[PDB]
From Swiss-Prot, chain A:
<keyword id="KW-0810">Translation regulation</keyword>
<dbReference type="GO" id="GO:0040008">
    <property type="term" value="P:regulation of growth"/>
</dbReference>
<dbReference type="GO" id="GO:0044877">
    <property type="term" value="F:protein-containing complex binding"/>
</dbReference>
<keyword id="KW-0238">DNA-binding</keyword>
<dbReference type="GO" id="GO:0140677">
    <property type="term" value="F:molecular function activator activity"/>
</dbReference>
<keyword id="KW-0678">Repressor</keyword>
<dbReference type="GO" id="GO:0004521">
    <property type="term" value="F:RNA endonuclease activity"/>
</dbReference>
<comment type="similarity">
    <text>Belongs to the PemK/MazF family.</text>
</comment>
<dbReference type="GO" id="GO:0043068">
    <property type="term" value="P:positive regulation of programmed cell death"/>
</dbReference>
<keyword id="KW-0051">Antiviral defense</keyword>
<dbReference type="GO" id="GO:0003677">
    <property type="term" value="F:DNA binding"/>
</dbReference>
<keyword id="KW-0255">Endonuclease</keyword>
<comment type="subunit">
    <text>Probably a dimer. Forms a heterohexamer composed of alternating toxin and antitoxin homodimers MazF(2)-MazE(2)-MazF(2). The binding site of MazE and ssRNA or ssDNA are largely overlapping; the presence of only 1 MazE molecule inhibits mRNA endoribonuclease activity. Binds to EDF but not a mutated EDF (NNGNN).</text>
</comment>
<protein>
    <recommendedName>
        <fullName>Endoribonuclease toxin MazF</fullName>
        <ecNumber>3.1.27.-</ecNumber>
    </recommendedName>
</protein>
<keyword id="KW-0378">Hydrolase</keyword>
<dbReference type="GO" id="GO:0032991">
    <property type="term" value="C:protein-containing complex"/>
</dbReference>
<dbReference type="InterPro" id="IPR003477">
    <property type="entry name" value="PemK-like"/>
</dbReference>
Length: 107, 104
């Protein structure tokens, strides 16, 4: 067997059990495969089903579900340790716009 | 008396209980509206590793680990202010985080 090392723009299911944490919840990964693999850690943002319309939300549409990425919520978590399964991936269009909102908050 | 909402470039001392110092990243207006900040933790023991960015002043030397950025609720975690990082320092940290998060 061989673990799944989260890759950028992957949408994963990660382990949080410690506001805006909860878990087990979905996140959109940010850091590239190279990093995540070596470090065993990854940068990612939490997602949710209920969009309240706050300004850093980025919508995610697909199949028969609609959900939202909260970009300001960027967190470096240890994906290996918490344990993570891969729910799917996000459109590059969607990923771009996330990172875009992150810039707004930093740099 | 009015509280202290932490600002970008500030060095805050915040106790993670998921203390310890961190360089704040997100701006005042946001950090204040949301009661949350972005920042990266810093340590005294530093070893060789790329996403370190070294903080220098007075007697102490330290390093911010640029690659671990966290969105933390600074109010509940009761953050207070130890000092302020040099701009050259902030930018550098920022730029590292870029290479990690980037654009494309």
């Amino acid at each position: 067997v061989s673990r799944y090392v989260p890759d950028m723009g992957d949408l994963i299911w990660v382990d949080f059990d410690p506001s805006e944490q909860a878990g087990h919840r979905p996140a959109v990964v940010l850091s590239p495969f190279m990093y995540n693999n070596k470090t065993g850690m990854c940068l990612c943002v939490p997602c949710t089903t209920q969009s309240k319309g706050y300004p850093f939300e980025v919508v995610l549409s697909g199949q028969e579900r609609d959900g939202v990425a909260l970009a300001d919520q960027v967190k470096s978590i240890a994906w290996r340790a918490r344990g993570a399964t891969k729910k799917g991936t996000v459109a590059p269009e969607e990923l771009q716009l996330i990172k875009a909102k992150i810039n707004v908050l930093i740099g």
